[PDB]
Amino acid sequence: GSIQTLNLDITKVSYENGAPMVTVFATNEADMPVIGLANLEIKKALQLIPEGATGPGNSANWQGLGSSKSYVDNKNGSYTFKFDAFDSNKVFNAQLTQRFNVVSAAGKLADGTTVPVAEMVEDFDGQGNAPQYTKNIVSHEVCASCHVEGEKIYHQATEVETCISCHTQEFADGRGKPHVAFSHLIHNVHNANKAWGKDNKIPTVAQNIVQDNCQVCHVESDMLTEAKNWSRIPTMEVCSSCHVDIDFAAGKGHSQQLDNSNCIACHNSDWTAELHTA
Ligand code: HEC
Ligand code: HEC
Ligand code: HEC
Ligand code: HEC
Ligand code: HEC
Ligand SMILES: [Mg+2]
C-alpha cells in the first residue's frame, strides 16, 4: 500500500497549563484517517509581531516560541501535541496571532504503507480561534512552477511556509546574518546582483528565468490578504536584497535613512508596482 497525499489539518488549539495543546488530524487523498504516524512534529511554534511594533515602517515578523515532537496518537486519525518547553524566552503574548508549522517526515507505517512528506502552517488568535491579522504574502503554489513538488528546495523542507517559519528576521539577526531572513534570501537567490551561500554562487540561471518579475511569486489571492506587501511595505532589509549597492546608513547611492520610518512616504505602492512591472 502507499499514500499519494498526506493532508494535515489542525482541528483544535487549546491553552491550558498555559502552553498550547494542539490536535492534528491526518488523512490520505481519499479523506481516510491515517493512524500510526511516527514522525509528526510541530516544527515551529511562532507568534506574529505586527507591522510597526519593532519600529516605524517595519514589517510584521515571526517570533519563536519553541517546537514539539511530543504527541499522543489518538488512534482515529488525530494526534495531540504537548510542549515540554514552550516559550522558553517568556515572550508569549495572547494578543498576537499564533502560528503552528506541522510536518510529517516521509516514511512508512507499522504495516509497511509508505507515507509521503507533509507540511502545513495554520494561524490562530491567542486563544485558538480565528486569527485577527496575518502575514500571508506568498503561498507554495508559485514555487511549484519552477521547483519539483514534494522534493526539498535547497534543504530542510518542501513548502515555502515551512521555510518562512524558520528563516525569520529574529533568526537571521540573532546569527549576525540579516541576509538569511526569508524575505531577503528569496530575492537574493534569484537575483544576480549579489552572490549567496557557502559557494558564493552568482544566480545567473535563476536571473535569466525569473528576470526580477515580481508577479511570478507575488500574486493576488483571497487566501493571501497581505499579497500586496511586495509594493506596500518597502524596507531596507528587503529592498536591499537586489538593490545591493545602496548604503542607507552612510548615504551612499541614496539619501541616508537610519530606519524604515519614511520609505513609504516616497516609495508609494503604485510607483513601486509600476516601475518593477514590464
Ligand atoms: C521560475 C519562474 C521560478 C519561481 C517561481 C521560483 N524559483 Fe526558485 N529558482 C529558480 C531557478 C531557475 C533557480 C536556479 C536553480 C539553479 O540551479 O541555479 C532557483 C533557485 C532557488 C533557490 C536556490 C537553489 C540553488 O541555486 O541551488 C531557492 C532556495 C529557491 N529557488 C526557492 C524558491 C521558492 C521558495 C519559491 C517560491 C516562493 C521559488 N524559488 C520560485 C526558478 C524559480
Ligand atoms: C530551520 C528549521 C530551517 C528551515 C525549515 C529551513 N532552513 Fe534554510 N537555513 C537554515 C539554517 C540554520 C541556515 C544557515 C544560515 C547561516 O547561518 O548561514 C539556512 C540556510 C539557507 C540558505 C543559504 C542562505 C545564505 O547563505 O545566504 C538557503 C538558500 C536556505 N536556507 C533556503 C531554505 C529554503 C528554500 C527552505 C524551505 C524549503 C529552508 N531554507 C528551510 C535553517 C532552515
Ligand atoms: C519568488 C522567486 C519571488 C519573486 C520573483 C519576488 N518575491 Fe518578493 N517575496 C517573496 C517571498 C517568498 C517573500 C516572503 C514572504 C513572507 O511571508 O515572509 C517576499 C517578500 C517581499 C517583500 C516583503 C514584504 C513585507 O511585508 O516585509 C517585499 C517588499 C517584496 N517581496 C518585494 C518584491 C519585489 C518588488 C519583487 C520584484 C522586483 C519581488 N518581491 C519578487 C518571493 C519573491
Ligand atoms: C529584485 C527581485 C528586486 C527587489 C526585491 C526590488 N527591486 Fe527595485 N528594481 C529592480 C530591477 C531589476 C530594477 C530596474 C528596472 C528597470 O526598468 O531598469 C529596479 C528598479 C527600482 C527603482 C528605479 C531605480 C532607477 O534606476 O531609476 C526603484 C526606485 C526601486 N527599484 C525600488 C525598490 C524598492 C523600494 C524595493 C523594496 C520594496 C525594491 N526596489 C525591491 C529589482 C528589485
Ligand atoms: C523620498 C524623500 C525618499 C525616501 C524617504 C526614500 N527614498 Fe528610496 N529613492 C527615492 C528616489 C527619488 C529614488 C531614485 C528613483 C530613481 O528614479 O532613480 C530612490 C531610490 C531607491 C531605490 C533604487 C536604488 C537603486 O538601486 O537605484 C531603492 C531600493 C530605494 N530607494 C529604497 C528606499 C527604502 C527601503 C527607503 C526607506 C529606508 C527609501 N528608499 C527612502 C526617494 C526616497
Ligand atoms: Mg543575489
Numbering used by the authors: 44 to 321
Authors' description from the paper:
An outer membrane cytochrome (OMC) termed MtrC binds to the surface of MtrAB and can directly transfer electrons to extracellular terminal acceptors (Edwards et al., 2020; White et al., 2013). In both MtrC and OmcA, the first five hemes are located within domain II, and hemes 6–10 are within domain IV.
Site‐directed mutagenesis allowed the production of a truncated MtrC variant comprised solely of domains I and II (MtrCDI,II) that is near‐identical to domains I and II of the full‐length MtrC. These spectral features are typical of redox‐active, low‐spin, bis‐histidine coordinated c‐type hemes, and together with the LC–MS, indicate the protein consists of a soluble MtrC pentaheme cytochrome mainly truncated at amino acid residue 325. X‐ray crystallography was used to determine the molecular structure of MtrCDI,II,sol to a resolution of 1.8 Å. The orientation of the 10 histidine imidazole rings that form the axial ligands to the heme irons is also highly conserved (RMSD of 0.225 Å), suggesting that the environment of the five hemes was unchanged. The redox potential window of MtrCDI,II,sol was similar to the observed window for MtrCsol measured under comparable conditions. This MtrCDI,II could interact with MtrAB, resulting in the formation of a 15‐heme MtrCDI,IIAB nanowire capable of reducing a limited number of substrates, but unable to reduce the key physiological substrates FMN and Fe(III) citrate. The in vivo catalytic experiments presented here demonstrate that the reduction of physiological substrates requires the full 4‐domain structure of MtrC, yet reduction of certain other substrates is still achievable via the 2‐domain MtrC.
